[PDB]
């Protein structure tokens, strides 16, 4: 009764004996039969716009429902065994990236998907061992999983490839020139602008946790918001503006409030006031100018000069 989870998975794996090459060939034939049968059913799904019943699917194969169902079962079990007996290979490949962003158990479960795909695309007629074809798919699945699940701010795969190529070019230049290359040298060699290189360098960074000792980092970061102090120069301002607005004629001030959205935050055109107000457009423009000219005088508006 162990508490470790990985060891329990390894024991569960060890309860399965490795296949032999003849066993692989036999299972591969049944897997291919299952794949072809599935393709046919998929055709029935396109024809029926619904899942075909086993009887309709058996009818599509001109097969007795019993024979068809048993063939289907055999194929299912064959694919199951092909994946099951190779999980050890999955673990053997996945152990080679246990320090890249994914836990060991995550590497195993992501490589299992690659093993499943490999078992779905293995060709016995090629005359090769399944352990050679499956390795590519397992490795690809694990690499893609790392590229898509290792970072909090996920980077696209092309960015990982770009960073790798930048590292390789930098090492090659360091070897050739016998010294650490400069930013401009690397940018020229990569045939990309220095700003792009700096952007790549900035985006490659790992996010630091909020609880890094400095005491934790998260207790030294201010909050986004308006300082209580900066909200009091807002209420104050409007009042001052409203006062100078009172001096203007009623119609004039209404015009101004509407032309700047002091009430609704939305600046309105001429035409909305042309329709909403009594007179039409080209009349509100005159009112706006005749109001501003009143405000522009040194009288009735001079406090706001300091707000600038």
């Amino acid at each position: 009764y162990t508490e470790d989870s990985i060891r329990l998975y390894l024991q569960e794996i060890g309860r399965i004996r490795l296949l032999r090459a003849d066993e692989e060939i036999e299972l591969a034939r049944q897997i291919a039969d299952l794949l072809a049968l599935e393709r046919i059913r998929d055709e029935l799904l396109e024809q029926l716009d619904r899942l075909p019943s086993d009887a309709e699917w058996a009818a599509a194969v001109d097969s007795p429902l019993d024979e068809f169902r048993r063939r289907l079962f055999r194929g299912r079990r064959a694919k199951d065994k092909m994946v099951q007996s190779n999980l050890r290979l999955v673990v053997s490949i996945a152990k080679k990236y246990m320090n890249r962003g994914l836990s060991f158990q995550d590497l195993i479960q992501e490589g299992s998907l690659g093993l499943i795909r490999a078992a779905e695309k293995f060709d016995h007629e090629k005359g090769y061992k399944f352990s050679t074809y499956a390795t590519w798919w397992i490795r690809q699945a694990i690499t893609r999983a790392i590229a898509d699940q290792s970072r909090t701010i996920r980077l696209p795969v092309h960015l990982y490839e770009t960073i790798s190529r930048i590292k390789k070019t930098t090492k090659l230049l360091s070897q050739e020139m016998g010294r650490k290359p400069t930013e401009e040298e690397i940018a020229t060699r990569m045939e990309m602008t220095i700003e792009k290189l700096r952007f790549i360098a900035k985006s490659a960074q790992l996010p630091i946790s909020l609880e890094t000792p400095i005491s934790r980092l998260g207790d030294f970061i201010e909050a986004d918001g308006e300082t209580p102090e900066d909200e009091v120069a807002k209420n104050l301002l409007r009042e001052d503006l409203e006062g100078v607005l009172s001096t203007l004629s009623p119609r004039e001030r209404d015009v101004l409030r509407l032309r700047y959205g002091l009430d609704d935050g939305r600046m309105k055109t001429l035409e909305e006031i042309g329709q909403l107000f009594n007179v039409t457009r080209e009349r509100i423009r005159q009112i706006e100018a005749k109001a501003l000219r009143k405000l522009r005088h040194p009288n009735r508006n001079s406090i706001l000069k300091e707000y600038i």
Binding site: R76, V83, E110, Q149, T152, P207, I208, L210, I221
Partner: peptide, 29 residues
């Protein structure tokens, strides 16, 4: 740099494993 709470990482683990489980249940693993 971006400073992130540990809840983000824990939630990402939960979501990743849940999505992988759904995929496995969809392909009859």
């Amino acid at each position: 740099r971006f400073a992130t709470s540990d809840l983000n990482d824990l939630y990402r683990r939960v979501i990743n494993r849940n999505n992988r489980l759904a995929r496995l249940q969809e392909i009859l693993a």
